[model samples]
Target chain A: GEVRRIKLYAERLADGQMGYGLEKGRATIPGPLIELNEGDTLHIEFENTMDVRASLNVHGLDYEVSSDGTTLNKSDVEPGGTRTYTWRTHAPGRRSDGTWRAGSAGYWHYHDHVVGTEHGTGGIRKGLYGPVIVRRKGDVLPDATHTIVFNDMLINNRPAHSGPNFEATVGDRVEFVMITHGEYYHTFHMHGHRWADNRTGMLTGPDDPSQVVDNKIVGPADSFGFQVIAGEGVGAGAWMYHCHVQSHSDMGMVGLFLVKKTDGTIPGYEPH
Target chain B: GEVRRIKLYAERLADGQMGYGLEKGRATIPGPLIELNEGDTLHIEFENTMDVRASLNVHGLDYEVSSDGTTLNKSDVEPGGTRTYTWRTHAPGRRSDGTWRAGSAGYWHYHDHVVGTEHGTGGIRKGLYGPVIVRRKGDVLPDATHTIVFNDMLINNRPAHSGPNFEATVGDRVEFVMITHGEYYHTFHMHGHRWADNRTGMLTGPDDPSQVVDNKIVGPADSFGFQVIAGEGVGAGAWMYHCHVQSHSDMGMVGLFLVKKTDGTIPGYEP
Candidate 1:
């Protein structure tokens, strides 16, 4: 497992083509990737900007219902506000049962669950959502981490044509964790790699019989992950990655993964 | 320019999923496909069979603006209701300069514009949408017509894997009119052929399309139609069709179109 803890903030971002995000962090339109081993503690220091009440509500987690950031009764935050919510994960552990067995590790979500809809605040669809991946203890870690989101008709809130190009070094194993939050059905496609099955995308790799250009369809509520050897560092350039569905990509739901030498002259660029 | 009367009803259907249709019994979830020539006066004798308030909303037409179908001021329908919405079309016609000119021929979507937002009742997302195709006077007619809709993440209210298989004979012209009804965007992709000009919601470039995808993306308020030559009516066989979004296909956004013999009996499933 090559990911870390879940520590982030929820801020009310300006509602534009892309909705909301962290005050100045990765969790924005496509909220931050909150992934770790199952049964770990997820603590979010929610910060609200703008002039509305915004809060972080999580789904499919081993946590509290009182923090169920869904409605008005469960009030969120006021403008210029700050709050914290703590959550825990589940993984295979020593026997609470007389006989040792599996514990917990799974997929979850983190998003704006602002209640008190007073003609202003928005939850979920306001463009404030991200993935919470809970993996097993021995999960194979990829060389680089990438989060490709099917946000609206666009990918990762950028009209595919304008979305960011994921940067990586030549010898990196890039894993893309995909999710969606809009109303369309989407498929994630990477130009240079393949996987065994969509779930976990383990076992089979590039062009195996079981890996024939398909992973689970990522809905606004569904998620899946797969990894590719970024030209194994030898092949360095730009590769296309997008929703395989025809119209989505053509209509600006496209992006690229740029693999190049770390020493190459570059500014304002960071490799994952 | 001809004035033809087309009557349609809005009945709450129990056929399968939550559905509604026009009077001819054709338009249901994915509603109806109303194709007319330019300058045709269309009147809908809409009948609402649901317990809630329902109303019809027309887009891209020439008619009464008072019926814009947005807010409560527009007026909707109640349980067991009857209403009429008159609309007109514009086609190739004479210009003010007296020269032969064109009118309007394109695609659109019709849906329910039920008001009363204080409560919860959205007719459009509730399977109340259909395609509207206004063709030119000499437009070639398809031997058969079908409309496949991506409404509520389901195709025509049928789970993707179980949707109807459009059946036709070889040599027949099978036309598929497409639309969407949910707030989210959707893309429709068919397996085999491509549109003649790739005009159905795809790249609008002047050059010939480089990809053979028959994917057309539509929103809650758009419509488009394309025709497929059924096995050339002699190239009889079956082709798998579906929304190309990989997850959609896996989630049952799929269907089939059978191009076969008139009586239909064959092997290798060939034409």
Candidate 2:
């Protein structure tokens, strides 16, 4: 309903990785979960602390070519330079020609488009991407939201076999934003939970014919999000989420959704 | 809504490939399009005319384990043997617990579950698969239906750069069942059309929040379908549909949806 302004920083992490953060020293691989409602506009004053040039480019939203953050567009910032990138969203409406226009509400994302290549190959590989969720007016809100990025067979660019696991209590409404990047395709499958394969990853009702799936195949630049009641039908446990491709799962593209009982204990799960 | 019986033959084609055909010696790659409405039962009397053992396995429908057509289920037939497989579909309904059970209405397929390997790796590689579509009550019907199977790097097992092109007149409601098989992933893209990524591939209404996409990512065993008005908005032409994966498209997984004007001419299209 209103325009907003925020500060973002592109900085080098301690481990030779790049990231975006609200604060300079607090940069994270996924940066932060940016949420916007329909009809909102965000102006991000992005600073590049890294010695190399970088810029913020977003997907599934409206922005002018100048905010495109590409070398072709000349929107990338030099070392120690800053730029304000504006992103706008609108509600779905009828066009003058009577065709229905899609709203900006979707599971979208952003990254450093100029980091290592025009496509941000090196930047996304190292970690200069994050989730951006645009919500409709009546959409349901979740108690918690987690971001999962299947980047080059690694979860959030972490080493294989190491999980950035998420925790939730039974009955808690949890949301997951699944984003994929890099050169490979992976099937994201979650154990003991399922979601409708649609815009909100939910069935509108009994009449909604969307398919319910626990596994979905995705490729680079594809993103979707869903909400589920933690341990709704299948109660409290250490639920494993992994790439369903046999080889990829064997190689450790895996993590867990640790759903615990109200007593704060997960059944049959031994934490390290 | 009633019982139906059909005969199917599993025979070897002239080119050393295998296929399922309604008649002998007339097997086609990707087989035939089998359509069914909700609450229908189809009994397929499948005869294996090939030398090696093969079976008919289906997806997105209800069949007993006995009709599973898997070797593990002992449903495969030996050479010269015949087996009757019964497939059933149901309409969506409310469960006792108040949960919604999805109907069998979807874009589904069938393949050999036992051919070269237990997983039908050999049979599918040699072209033994087909499309199965299950429709629900009140669903929209299309003028024509075409099946596009992204088998391996080839489209419908055809050679690279050779298209199994589909034809349509302007304003025809054309439906496409897109399926993928074998061991790779691809992005299916159409040059000048889009569909809502929902059950019917069309929006329920203005309130439906489905994403309209021109491209979709798919993997092995994944199937989906959509219907588009031929040359809707963008008028008659030779519209290319291909794998959007740069390397995959370079390797020639492409085809055409040739939409012709009323006079049977495609604007600026030589073909």
Candidate 3:
């Protein structure tokens, strides 16, 4: 299986702005949707552009212990430094006894847990985070897809961030990963739809993988996963996913994820 | 009893800088322990020197209800407006049956809770508050006394006051009236000392005359009272009292309350 390589840059915006603004050379990853098969290998090249160091951790995928990206095994790409992690998805698709099916089929994410007290607990809040989705070998695809990354942030190292207000079309299967990256804990809540955790890892118990697991207070460099069913009947239009910490979300650390129907009828998604 | 009137003035300091430094018109009521005997009548005349309207609300005193300062009432004064509240210590002494024991025997405070949205709760945070004290008739007194007032404030009408450190002497009995004049809620706490709320009236049973009554979520014009036995082993030295709303206290809404013993021997009290 050929390794799929993706590069992510870490950067910071000015006091009241987001790093995801219309700026180039920022942390923007431009490409077609990243698709993964059952046995494909994925390698991520992470570049730290900020003055601080950082490391990348991906949620959802099952890989070798070394690829887990926990603080102990974390590799620091110092300010202007770069590092890469290569891992293969070799978890079997069937139970060891061959009586039941196995393998995870859900949403995931990638974030940095770089060195430096400033970037601890997943440097994503400082703009070192994004989403990663893994699909079963031949699962039927939804009409349209939207990705969202939620963050809990602080001002002057204090809790601060705005609420999530993302828009979606009438019938889109919106997959999102609500990631908490900061000193405190947060409960990521979506207003319109009930989401599910896609990462079939220890974070989510093995006995019941689909059950949503409340990720405990994770200190610098941790991540979690979940998915949502957006679109018509489920309430179309604008919705939000924010840190239930209320205060942090009100400080402007929220982003949007839009969902639209696949029939090509939604105005925004209409052909150019 | 005849009303013993006292005049206090509010002079303007530079914009955003008042009460404690490089500011103007700040006055202190230095004292040889002014006594408030059980049945004395008192009148306070507050003169505002600044261009803005200002008022005052006194703790532990009952005044007549009227806009004009002529009739004393248990209400607030208006900015640029004159109002008087009369104090009649008519409650029976501890020896009397069903007597109303004065919860506080030390210092209390007064703050401006005038009409108009800006000057009421929000304005006081900028430094429009001060103190007053109540003493039981013939009670033993300290040689000298000092006063302090606490206001939970914000910057630009937002929660932005930083917590200020407090200092006091050993063996000093200090009284504090933690007042909140803002639209927001706050938990005013003093570090190092477990003080008593002499004005728990805001949270007591209804129709209870002895119970001090007011709203805990003090709106634009409300205050609370507490007393601390300051000094060594009684929670002495530098301390803090600010809004427990973490952010507000961290901003600058805090101030210091220092207590000095009668002997004036505490290390930090003099400096």
Candidate 4:
């Protein structure tokens, strides 16, 4: 697949405190999910209007050395300046002789590599991060997709047991693609939903069945990807999904997920 | 694997106002669950302690001739008298060619066959019902079990939103064996747990699965069995389990189903 023109803009704004926090719209705590299919090319340009400086560091994929975005090695996006990153993906496939080949397909992330003062941690604390999903060709997209960004003891910038819950309908297959920033290790414990046996989700069927679904462990340095069936069970109302680690959730790293219903929408979710 | 001797005592009672009712030990409005394994012999003696007469009408599986306990066709235990019923079970087996054979395994219910007025209707109306579970040899017994006996417009003798509820642990596999003995058809719905693919639990696996696993319908003169895994995602405290029909549940056929921890100590109650 090919990824054509991707655009990102970085600007200076207040965290109600700091003078510089990278931007998307207006100081986007978490920018956006840079979505792309395997075999596709991504050409993303970052327009930095910050008073100081910032750079987008993408983890796990390949790019030309000139645009690695590793502070200084590659010039930081000059204030009121711009730079673009170009990349392609490879899919796992069979060879002419019937041998399997590994492909660079997975869920990766990106953030500001160049930081001012408080270092990347301050930039991260002020919120400078986003998700990057690279999927293999022929993979089915979920009916509804959501992301849990565990950063500095907050889930998507909200404290545990607070606002910012998610919603989905029955007969809907959901994806909880997760990523983390900062130094804290976080766990995503979704109440009432689990994907069987840590499936890479490369394939699905009877031969490729999911295992006993349950809560999973995830953190900043660790990479994670999984899916769960939302309404297949007899559950309704708000179910709590939070970090199993008492401190994390207590410090406010939890959320509620609600499951709804569809009118025999055949399969998956149907717009109602 | 082994046959355990079982016993049950039946008697008639006054549902106040001189109305009729049945019992296993004392005056049981709804009889107790008759638990038995395949090949086990039941020695239930109906001691009709009421002023009139009564009998045990066993359902499902195979019972010997002497203990038919059928109210009229064969005999009815006379007033102030007693009679014991005997029965056996058939298990799912393999054929001579080594292929598997489906057993006589099932979830059934039993009721009173004798009554004082209009034959057995008076007995059933006044209360005479219970559950009978016959398992296949080698099958895993459920960690927790409950039954919905909807007869005479009452669920286990209580209206909806009343007291009696169920409890199980997160790792436990639970069974809801439902049966009916009244005129109306009732549906079973459990919150937070389900048998995949809307099945009646005839069989289960990933490939051969159930669809839209929510509510299932069962009624008088019918049998049904299904299982659900509790708390796979997030569950604790009292969850509601009841009949889906508005009028049915509104009339009192609902219960609280609590999903507990894996410790198996059962603290909210230690019975």
Candidate 5:
């Protein structure tokens, strides 16, 4: 229930890709993970260190039309300019008309909205996006969190066949935030893992009727997150998570979830 | 709670496309909506009246390997042949492994599996598909139902910009079963209406945390359904429904939901 403030910078990385960071001269492809609890508010002091105009646009939360981060709203920052964007979250409640309104606790994202095209096509392609997680009270917490952005044909803007692979120990509670961007839709599939297609990836209880699936189709700007106990039913192994579209997977849009055994070894996996 | 039987036909329509019907020569593009309860069984006496091999494949329900409806399963019928396919449904229950099993109640679909290609590319392109609805015991029923199949660039095999529009009066509960096929993906969006992104497309109760959305992205073989009280928040008029892909909509993947006033008049809309 507190209002927090953070300094964020949009900078051009050494590889010519743009990213968001908490400080100057230390930007990563995915920027940084922004987490907040329900009923909380965040005010970001955003600095555009790049030579181009950019803006911060977000989804699944509440912001005034002035903070829309679109050129139509004139919220974009010019070259070497700065702006403050405020986002608010709330708990679920009934409206005066007695209809239920959804809360802002969801898996969401933020990206540049004024680069190249008004839709941020050029900024997202050059890696100016990141994951945001808003959690409700009493939600289960994971031991670790990882972000997987399927931007166009690359995973986290990495080259083809190169993996931003994740590592975990068996029995560790791991969370994944999956966000899709750019054009084209894809089916995200993970071997030996499944989650419920609901507000939360895990079912609320036995009475929850959400479908349990290992594969799901998604398009640009769609985001979801889930938690899985590593090697829960299946033993420790190198599990593959990739886009289910055959041609997309063949083109090297894939990553590995390496769950190691208690002895710190993965069966049948040789490090490259 | 009952065992039902029905006769279905696979025939070539007069326009040279194909379809499924409850009787011979009565084939339609989207066939007919098959509704059932959770604890029921259906035996489809399928007769292929066409000159090509075709089979019935369904999603989100229970069927044994003998009724897989794939060429590999050898369940396809020869030209002018007949076969009986059995489908089963069950309520949600706890498994012996202590996991919650999903029930067979969902907005599902049936399509050809062995026509043109092993995946039924040609059969579906020529219109051999339909909608299936399995309901939980307490699911609310709608006053009227409509099926919208986004098959390729057309709606139910109709020409682009030509709408297979649906009609209803204000305050009537209208349900829509949306299914997609062919080789592309699309975002189904309807103006002035929205539904929860959950199993039934409606919120279960005040605590249901499903997201309410007017646009949903779906790929080939993905299907979902929802019920909207026609013009509930908005007044009765002509509402537009279309694929949200810019090029897809520009290429004419669109339709209309004609909701009229109680007196049977549509404001500002002629014909």
Candidate 6:
């Protein structure tokens, strides 16, 4: 099969102004919930978009740690460098052979964790991360699939709306993927609901198969993932999602996720 | 009138944990709140205990802004230097026109808002501030008077604790006199209830004499006062008073002002 080309650009910005700066003008890949059967292969080709070097580290996936698109590789995506990573999804479920389910599904993340200065994670903090959702074959899709991306940007890292508000219909399933491109560790916390971790990458929860409790501290050139199930009785209202590190959140590292009623009437939303 | 003597010192911390590597120690002012009639004159002799230069800036009082501290001819107080500031508590009803007033009876703050950068007003950021309380002519002193001084050392000048695990008490009548020794603007915010700015200092809010709001912005070398009535349904909990700059508060420029019941059953409240 042909390779799926995923282009990413590593840029730089002040402490809390990523998505609002140069990174805001670039195009992004928007994905809906995807269900994959066993024995499938996923390939991605990333093209560096900055004058400096960069790489991508997919959280939860087992790849060559050295070549994990981290800072260790002095290979600069210099001005116009290109790189590619390939992986196959073909492990079996818990059997006598310890392979234990080659294919699992949930929320995953992709980012650049290359080492940089003490200030930030090089270009990674410059808005270089997104979401990847995988599901088991024959599994029915949730009522609705929503993507929530968190970036340490000036505009709070949410989709742009034409009117004074943005709305989501009720009974829809939500997937919130938050990535912190700052020097400090940002705990992306969302009120009203909890999320599940679906990536085949790093550290996961103990009992809960879907949630990621202990974050796989992805330094400069790393990425992470989490999933959310919006439950009923969660009335029509606005919700807040922000960095758990109190200080950054106070400096505008927060945004609102508004869930409207199934009736289709839109409610007002404002920025802080 | 006889001259009263006060001693001030700055010793290096053996733990090497002073503010940004500078020497850190406590300032000791041993004297009771001097009782003075409306027209009595106060002659204070400030003695420097450390080898570093020491000066004084008394908030809520009216005096000439001079370095010498002389009655009329002001001069600077160098290291091992002693100066005097003379003032007549002549203004009745008010403590001093344009100065802070203890209306009836309340708390106040005093420190060194000296000139230059090395060890003058800037030294206060390293722990050179204290509290002052004024009582009516014949008002009886409370069983125990608590002195809570506000300093700026938290990250971005924010309150030290502002998480879900924080609370303040009601009816405890706590007062905070905040002094900013840095060159930035600090927004001192007290959670739950608002405070009254009894001092004539640079702060944000209505300049009206009657409607002083809850929040106030204090500038460098400036001092502001706030009174909180603790206990009842209002003040019985762990409350936080921090810098509103967020970053400054996060960096360690914030502190907590715990308000407890007058009964003295709260934890960490000795006596």
In terms of lDDT, which candidate is strongest? 2
lDDT of 3 by residue, B173-248 (tens): 4444444444454444443343222332111221111211111123344445544345323233334344433344
Q: What is the DockQ of each candidate?
A: 0.01, 0.09, 0.01, 0.01, 0.09, 0.01
Strongest candidate by TM-score: 5
lDDT at residue A188 of model 4 (Cα atoms): 67
- The regions of model 2 sitting more than 4 angstroms off are A1-183, A186-217, A220-272, B269-271
Candidates 1 and 3, the one with greater TM-score: 1
Candidate 6 regions off by >4 Å?
A: A1-25, A28-38, A65-67, A71-76, A95-106, A113-120, A138-166, A195-231, A244-248, A266-271, B1-271
* Candidate 6 backbone clash number: 65
The list of candidate 5 runs beyond 4 A from truth reads B1-183, B188-195, B199-202, B206-215, B219-271
Q: lDDT tens string, model 5, B1-271?
A: 6898999999998677899999877899898899999989999999999899989988988998778889889899999999999999999999999998889999999999988999999999999999999999888888999999999888899987788889999888789999999988887867556677877876766568575556689888999999877865456766667775545655677787888888998755422
**On residues A1-272, what C-alpha lDDT tens digit does candidate 1 reach at each position?**
23233345554444442244444544466676666676566566666664666766554444443343433224366777766666554543333322222233434456564533321123444566677676766677877677777766866666448867888877777777776654567777776566545335555334333444543455554555666777652367666777778898788777878777767532343422
RMSD (Å) of each candidate, 1 decimal: 19.5, 8.3, 18.7, 20.1, 7.9, 20.5
Clashing pairs in 2: none
TM-score for each model: 0.48, 0.61, 0.37, 0.46, 0.62, 0.38
Local accuracy by lDDT, each model: 0.58, 0.85, 0.43, 0.58, 0.84, 0.42
What does candidate 4 score on TM? 0.46
Score residue B174 of candidate 6 by CA lDDT. 43
**Which of candidates 1 and 5 is the stronger one according to DockQ?**
5
- List the lowest-lDDT window of 10 residues for candidate 3 chain A: A93-102
What would the C-alpha RMSD of candidate 3 be, to one decimal place? 18.7
Query: How is the predicted docking of candidate 3 categorized under the CAPRI scheme?
Result: incorrect
lDDT of 6: 0.42
User: Residue by residue across B209-248, what tens digits does model 2's lDDT show?
Assistant: 6865566898888999998778664567777677755456
